[PDB]
Symmetry: C3
Subunit: 564 residues, 3 copies
């Protein structure tokens, strides 16, 4: 009996939101403009009893990271040489070392501009066949063109830059938090238990590949299979492996590099000669460990189609960029044929080798970015990588069999695989509750699942952490919004007569039309975000009573001071 | 007797200022780069008894909007193709369809670059005569040049962009307001009554035209005639109409469009062939409604030159861009001859047709911006528009007659015609007043014309609204200044011992050397901005007394606490 | 006995820091983009008894100013014409007027592009010999090239821009200050007395020269000799003069200027013809005033090598940019030979003339910036300048003699010479001290060397001044950090129960484990920054006691209000 409303600040309570996360680096493109070096030391905290719903296929971190990478790794071409003076009538013949012919390359000859513009030099380069296009149908002829020269002018990548994926961390600006699921076999969506808060993510490697996920974070106890709706054939399946399989890939033949003058100051790097022995670019996977993996995926894949047998087949065919395994290695771009790898059947109970083609002229993502020329790297090249996961699609011609095929290249699905466990939220530090009072007239959100009385002992902790080119403007935009939110909070607390105090008591009587729970049933038996959810719809009524009450009270005081 | 100073916060009082307004859009160039989509719902409030002076010919909104439009609609050319490879020796002959010769166009032939640089293609386009210049005086010859190729390299407008005027709203940042005159026949300057405040303007269409104002907001009850000083012949007269007259304009002949290759990726759009019948580009106005309008302007124009007769004549002659009616329609640029329209006399008590020329190479405003090539639009084109107003100038050769002529093209005068009714002001929420107290030891400005005691009941309303490329930077710079102003306010209230409270009372005695009015004569019979105007010169004395008093008081308290 | 901790705000105390100072201008490149016009009126204040250590060879103002100048005066080339169409096979012969041959210049002829691209014009210019390079070794021949056309494409400086050094002021953002040494013969490093604070520096002229410092601020009473370590031969010596010597320099021959068409809109300015008489570019210094200066430097230079004789010799030889006196005059760039000037010996007790070469193609600083073409200025040119100081280096071949030579061109050393007297600091307005109290339950830093009790009478002064492309972003970044620092201060004062008050008293008892000094020995006999230095290591203990105490106190009050 005789309840009145009280206002609290620094309540551990939150709402679902979207806002620009800042890029954080340990200790090249990322750590030289978009990402601040900031050595984010691990600072996780477990939340005792909270439950949240998480959803991989709506997490705005993936679409933020896609825009961040696309923008950054288009902007990193801006200082470098345009190959516009190289769109020249290109005359070509078969490439040959004294040791043999190379079928993957042509030998081409052209005219180039010097820093003395009025003279032109006859010059030659070897080019990989998939970047050269024939210039007329009229006769079988030696005359060719660079493939980009009907669509875009390409930029060479400056040889100081390197594409090796550095680990990237994402972090919350002040007044926001990241929540993380620890639960085994989370299935990418639905109700989760054992949540933690972390001020930043673990390292996400910005690795780009089309059918096999290379160097990703491993699965924790058993194979996890994820998609929006397994019944719908139009949705990608992400498969996340527990025990790795290791892929070794190489260009086995030694290429020499030459520099061509191409006007004032600018220079073009191209393949000059091949040193000795010749063999095609290739990769190996250990056949038994692949078989075991393909089987162990199989028995988890069966549980969603229980009575049907399952079998694996080639990708959809056509253009290399979808029907093949793409990746970057040493700075060269490899495309490999996977027909040997995805070939088998399952119902119960040596090395395989892949062969590849190399390209230099590449369209980085889905026609959104500039055409890049990848400059050649000298000598032999090798990469070691871990296959962490598979991207699959499911085809009826049959009732007893399901048929699965490699697919990918909506680049978001690679970054979704590292970000399945994460959610972004906004802290809302104000709240109101009933109490028996009259006015006289351990970490960022740490308590959040607890009894409301316990959280009232730690209010200061959620109070302090409220305050602290695109890459510049978004930091200033984030910081100013964080300041403006804090000032609105303190201004309401001024207008209600609390005037900078964390727990505050007021003459507005509680109304049973809002809630009827006992004082102990509120204070001992409920957790703050549940109380907030219940009072939510009435909340905008309460603030009007507080403002008029303070205005009445100040007029009564201002009157009395003339007679006191 | 026994008055002391009191400090108030959220007083409805203001000063005249300039500060960059933010561009707002309903729901192409404006709403996709400079202007935020923000669907500004109408939120006007009338002010009861305030009077202000307004002045059209010094309103810094017009010069802000001019810079905003010039900057934006120069920046919208930045991504598009440069026609530098088109400055070529251009060889030309008369244009002819089997149906006849076209006198407005030449047929020109030239050499163009392909994405294969080492070959050149012979190619042709039709060009409108006013964009082509003859290349030597030596003989009457077929050799010509594009007009821009001695001054600037032109950029084509990208065909995704469209020039149709979307309505633009201007809004006040926090701590500022817009005031509006409702008064009929305001005459553009002087003392106004019935003012309103509005958080944003109505829609201003950014329409560009040189002699007749198209699609502007109409006059409310009778024809309004505006200028700085009607006696001075050197000043433009704006005339604002009550009942519209409707203009229909067309290109009646069907033009086919062709795309020319112009190096890698880039393409040029030009007129290829004309389909059939040929007739000159023309406009119509209904002759009786024009006559009635020209007469009804006449009887209001007489009242400033009472005894003299008035007559209308051609523009000043010379170059098309001043001596003709320019406008844009469907994306083509029309220039029309107005000699038929401004021809008549007045002393008391069918369609007219105009004929036109089309240009593609245009200098958008007074040599300030890039040269734009307007790409041709296929088929026949028509526009319907309302003539809202006239721009005039007055020529002595006579005593009985005044002679009036069309003039314009200082682009500000079109935007002045939509912004005549508006003023920008800064809220100054602090103030001091006398009271009988000792210290113990409905909308954004809504009340502003009222008795001071009444405004003291609504102080919170003026308190809350104090807080909330160039297009990015100017919003951060506006927001940070709004935060810094608020913090200075709260810091003074700290230094004076009010420490976050809206009405505050102090031991500094009022001094008759500042003012001598009775307590009721202050509090009942005056309005806040008048009291502020009166106390203005003394105000900087008062703040020194407040600061030293608080410092004395705190030392006295800090002493006593050792003995309390 | 019975001491308790008290918190103060606006304490005059500071720490050593770096933060980006803002450029300010009196009343062209500086005052039109990087530098605000703000006519910064002199506002120095002397500090009574403070001492600080200053160090010229670690002052981050010099490295900030270097980055500011390099960035600005590279960015000022961005709008102007690229000379890429001028890298042409250039055919040349000896230059001759009817009056004679000029040995410093060639006459060169070339082909240029018109705004009509398909025609080329035969055209000629005179060029200064040091900017032209011979194109093949095969024979002694008339064929040449512009020197930049193997490294960079140069930009012409737009003739509206001017390089005359305007005085630049550097100023502190809110929450920072600049401190200044007034002491005579400061020796560039170590403990200083008679310090002042000033909100901005005096005018620093951004003058660039390589061996003699022109137009710098003079020495105040006697010659000052400065370096990190005079024993180390690898360190530059700065010598700062008391009485000036005046240098007059000229190009005595009249050059006519011609404008060449170089594609659409763009134009190139070059030397056309020489009017009449011919004589080499030269400078004069008065021989007796130089001798006296070189001697008077000598007797101060002896005091660091007491028994040795001292003698002066030529610079190191090789490339002009280090081995010669560079400067800019009227917009031309002069390089002069100093062998006549630095030639003499000292042990105890007419005009000299220098001859020069002119260049147009210049690399502004150490290969960091673009290559600039300096356009020719018409007519004869003269400059008057004051030699303010010398840059020297010391070479063993001997025991009785020290040998000194001109050196420079690490551009920082010119700006170090104007900034030797300055230091940047951060105000830290919080502090804690002991007092006998229980809780009931003249300028920017002006006092800073005084007794702590006296500073407590002026706390408000240090309180108010806490609050108020790269050139835009750095001002927003600075302002937002200044706001965020202030909000953190006020938030701690909230969490400790002071809630916006300048002197505040608390129930936390003082602990002898921190300090043991008498109450008067603290309050009367010590100055705030010394007390701050002493309490420094314990300080982070104190804030934990304050936060838990306030939380205890608020819970005790919130309990009692139910029973009051
Ligand atoms: C690619 O083509 C070039 C041009 O024909 C080859 O270079 C020539 O090689 C022969 C070898 O006997 C020499 O005699 C010529 O003097 C070379 N010409 C030049 C311009 O250097 C080159 O060997 C070919 N490379 C491959 C791998 O096919
Ligand atoms: C998941 O996919 C299934 C189909 O794969 C959706 O259910 C229906 O399936 C039948 C048979 O293919 C169709 O005729 C219906 O049109 C489908 N309904 C819809 C709305 O598509 C099912 O809806 C999907 N799940 C969700 C959450 O929409
Ligand atoms: C003063 O201006 C107000 C607008 O603030 C006018 O209000 C309009 O009045 C008419 C009837 O006369 C209504 O139909 C409108 O809906 C009103 N509102 C608006 C926004 O137009 C008012 O008439 C004016 N009064 C005087 C005496 O000038
Ligand atoms: C503009 O000039 C071009 C070039 O002369 C004309 O195109 C030619 O038209 C004749 C019609 O008999 C054809 O025989 C030629 O083969 C065309 N030449 C090309 C290159 O296509 C064009 O018809 C002229 N158009 C107008 C409207 O004058
Ligand atoms: C408005 O214009 C008139 C003239 O049109 C200005 O008054 C004077 O007019 C006579 C006769 O033309 C001139 O000899 C004077 O030199 C004019 N005076 C000035 C100061 O120009 C009148 O001043 C103008 N109004 C204002 C506000 O200046
Ligand atoms: C300490 O430095 C101050 C400057 O802060 C010196 O003040 C100058 O003193 C002379 C007379 O000696 C005056 O003419 C100047 O006007 C003073 N002000 C300035 C800005 O120069 C002061 O002399 C120094 N005192 C000592 C003992 O070093
Ligand atoms: C630089 O060279 C040009 C080109 O030879 C000289 O210009 C010629 O001067 C003679 C003087 O008798 C004239 O007959 C020619 O008609 C000029 N040619 C042109 C293209 O104008 C120029 O005089 C030389 N200048 C110097 C100072 O050496
Ligand atoms: C200042 O320079 C001197 C040498 O010019 C440094 O002292 C030592 O000098 C001897 C003889 O040249 C060398 O063998 C030593 O190696 C020098 N020591 C070092 C650490 O370089 C002296 O150290 C320099 N001053 C400072 C502050 O380092
Ligand atoms: C797991 O994934 C499947 C995909 O078809 C989905 O239908 C299901 O709702 C998810 N959650 C659980 C708890 O099974
Ligand atoms: C390899 O795995 C596939 C897929 O289950 C299976 O068809 C095949 O029999 C396995 N073993 C061998 C030796 O290929
Ligand atoms: C309590 O709530 C009801 C329903 O909203 C309302 O009618 C009543 O006025 C409220 N009580 C008070 C004291 O206003
Ligand atoms: C109206 O406009 C005329 C223009 O000549 C001006 O002189 C006058 O001051 C304005 N105001 C009034 C109330 O007439
Ligand atoms: C049209 O208006 C003008 C201007 O007053 C007048 O001279 C003319 O007589 C009017 N009537 C006709 C039929 O032109
Ligand atoms: C009142 O005003 C006069 C004139 O400014 C001044 O001399 C006097 O000191 C003021 N009164 C007090 C109490 O200071
Ligand atoms: C003065 O400069 C010399 C340079 O060798 C340096 O060693 C010395 O420490 C400086 N300071 C003093 C007070 O001499
Ligand atoms: C000039 O100064 C130098 C340096 O001390 C000295 O050698 C010479 O004797 C002086 N006098 C003359 C006349 O050169
Ligand atoms: C005083 O300081 C000592 C040493 O840090 C500490 O053990 C003691 O607990 C402190 N006193 C109080 C009252 O906490």
């Amino acid at each position: 009996e005789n309840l009145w409303v009280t206002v609290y600040y620094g309540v551990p309570v939150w709402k679902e939101a979207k806002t620009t996360l800042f890029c954080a680096s340990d200790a090249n493109v990322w750590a030289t403009h978009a990402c601040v070096p900031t050595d984010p030391s691990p600072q996780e905290l477990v939340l005792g009893n909270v439950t949240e719903n998480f959803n991989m296929w709506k997490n705005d971190m993936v679409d933020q990271m896609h825009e961040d990478i696309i923008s950054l790794w288009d902007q990193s071409l801006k200082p470098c040489v345009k190959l516009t003076p190289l769109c020249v009538t290109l005359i070509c013949s078969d490439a040959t070392v004294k040791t043999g012919t190379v079928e993957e390359m042509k030998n081409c000859s052209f005219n180039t501009t010097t820093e003395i513009r009025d003279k032109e030099k006859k010059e030659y380069a070897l080019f990989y066949k998939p970047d050269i296009v024939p210039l007329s149908e009229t006769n079988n002829t030696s005359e060719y063109r660079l493939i980009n020269c009907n669509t875009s002018a390409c930029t060479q990548a400056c040889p100081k830059v390197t594409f090796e994926p550095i680990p990237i961390h994402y972090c919350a600006p002040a007044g926001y938090a990241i929540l993380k699921c620890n639960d085994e076999t989370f299935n990418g969506t639905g109700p989760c238990s054992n949540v933690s808060t972390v001020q930043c993510t673990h390292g996400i490697r910005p690795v780009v590949s089309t059918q096999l996920l290379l160097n990703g974070s491993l699965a924790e106890k058993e194979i996890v299979i994820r998609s929006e709706n397994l019944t719908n054939n139009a949705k990608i399946i992400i498969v996340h492996l527990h025990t790795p399989v290791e892929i070794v890939c190489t260009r086995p033949n030694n290429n020499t590099r030459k520099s061509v003058r191409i006007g004032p100051g600018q220079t073009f790097y191209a393949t000059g000669d091949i040193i000795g022995d010749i063999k095609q670019a290739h990769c190996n996977i250990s056949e038994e460990k692949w078989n075991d993996t393909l089987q162990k995926v199989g028995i988890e894949l069966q549980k969603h189609f229980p009575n049907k047998t399952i079998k694996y087949n080639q990708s959809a065919g056509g253009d290399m960029e979808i029907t093949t395994h793409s990746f970057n290695c040493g700075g060269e771009f490899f495309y490999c044929n996977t027909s040997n790898l995805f070939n088998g059947t399952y119902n119960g109970t040596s090395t395989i080798t892949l062969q590849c083609r190399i390209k230099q002229i590449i369209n980085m993502w889905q026609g959104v970015g500039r055409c890049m020329y990848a400059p050649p790297i000298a000598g032999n090249i090798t990469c070691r990588s871990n296959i962490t996961g598979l991207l699959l699609t499911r085809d009826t011609n049959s009732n007893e069999t399901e048929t699965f095929r490699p697919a990918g290249g909506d680049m978001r699905d690679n970054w979704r695989s590292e970000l399945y466990k994460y959610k972004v939220v906004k802290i809302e530090p104000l709240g109101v509750a009933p109490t028996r009072c009259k006015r006289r007239v351990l970490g960022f959100l740490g308590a959040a699942g607890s009894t409301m009385g316990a959280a009232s002992m730690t209010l200061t902790v959620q109070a302090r952490n409220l305050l602290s080119p695109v890459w510049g403007i978004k930091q200033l935009q984030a910081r100013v919004l964080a300041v403006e939110r804090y000032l609105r909070d303190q201004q309401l607390l001024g207008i209600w007569g609390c005037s900078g105090k964390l727990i505050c008591c007021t003459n507005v009587p509680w109304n049973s039309s809002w809630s009827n729970r006992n004082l102990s049933e509120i204070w001992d038996n409920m957790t703050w975000l549940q109380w907030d959810k219940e009072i939510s719809n009435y909340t905008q009524i309460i603030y009007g009573l507080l403002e008029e009450s303070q205005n009445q009270q100040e007029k009564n005081e201002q009157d009395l001071l003339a007679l006191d």
